[PDB]
């Protein structure tokens, strides 16, 4: 038993709530959670902008000092951070980001990073500004993560849709 609320069940390990993840995060503080990461971790926009604004630009001087030790990460490849005042740990995880002409088929390479934790609160890889379908980055999702994740969906009108046409 976990104290993820309001989320409907897609499988087994799946379970997806129309959300702002920074709101959810907040409220929950959950051991892991996701960010919609680039490999610069230079959190502009997108669910990354959000975080990182929501800890008052902590996650963006711990994400610097990240990179001039490490380098950028992989197109498909992840880190774990700080979770700030959000989470106890943030996994940065980089999906595809279709308007720079990256593969959609490491979105499932993207994935298989959550397999490495229990339980997370996540977004949908490459969508929103990464530009990918948000479809097909469910499906992806599903059929890659073993272990318990919780998707918030911040459009309302893409969570309906999502529901909807889940098969
Ligand atoms: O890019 C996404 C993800 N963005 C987010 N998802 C969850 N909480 C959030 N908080 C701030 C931004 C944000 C994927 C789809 C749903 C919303 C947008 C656009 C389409």
Do not use: P, R
């Given at each position: 038993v976990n104290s993820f609320s309001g989320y409907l069940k897609l499988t087994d390990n799946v379970y997806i709530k129309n959300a702002d993840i920074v709101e959810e995060a907040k409220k929950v503080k959950p051991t892991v959670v996701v960010n919609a990461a680039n490999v610069y971790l230079?959190?502009?926009?997108?669910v990354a902008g959000a975080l990182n604004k929501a800890t008052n630009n902590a996650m963006q001087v711990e994400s610097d000092d990240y990179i001039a030790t490490n380098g950028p990460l992989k197109v498909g490849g992840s880190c774990v951070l700080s979770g700030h005042n959000?989470?106890?740990?943030?996994?940065?995880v980089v999906g595809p980001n279709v308007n720079k002409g990256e593969?959609?088929?490491?979105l499932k390479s993207a994935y298989?990073?959550?397999?490495?934790?229990?339980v997370l609160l996540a977004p949908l890889l490459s969508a929103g500004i990464f530009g990918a379908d948000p479809i097909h980055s469910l499906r992806v999702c599903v059929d890659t993560v073993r272990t318990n994740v919780y998707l918030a969906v911040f459009d309302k009108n893409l969570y309906d849709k999502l529901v909807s046409s889940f098969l």
């Open positions: 230079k959190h502009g926009g997108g959000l989470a106890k740990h943030c996994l940065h593969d959609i088929q490491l298989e990073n959550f397999n490495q934790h229990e």
